[PDB]
Ligand binder design. Structure first.
Ligand SMILES: CN[C@H]1CCCN(c2cccnn2)C1
Length: 93
């Protein structure tokens, strides 16, 4: 049975105006800005951007990749697909 989201989990993350996007739940570094309550720091593969999202916009990657893991024309998306498949836990700093 599912647990709550934790750092390192792989997802497709939905934002307004954008396709479900390959991403991961990030950790929060000592001294860094924390998310709002009930929100997680989401690192978007390919764009390397961070946004804060709640579970309603988070789709676990294994269950969802057949639907959402196809090439997209949008900037960064196909790099993102490579990252989540090939090195999803690397530093992209
Ligand atoms: C994939 N393009 C969007 C997706 C959602 C995350 N976006 C953010 C969030 C915070 C800052 N900059 N960009 C970029």
């Amino acid at each position: 049975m599912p647990h709550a989201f934790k750092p390192g989990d792989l997802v497709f993350a939905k934002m307004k105006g954008y396709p479900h996007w390959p991403a991961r739940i990030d950790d929060i570094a000592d001294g860094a800005v924390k998310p709002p309550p009930n929100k997680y720091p989401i690192f978007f593969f390919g764009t390397h951007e961070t946004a804060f999202l709640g579970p309603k916009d988070l789709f676990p990657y294994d269950k969802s990749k057949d639907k959402y893991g196809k090439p997209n024309k949008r900037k960064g998306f196909n790099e993102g697909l490579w990252e989540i498949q090939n090195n999803p836990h690397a530093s992209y700093s």
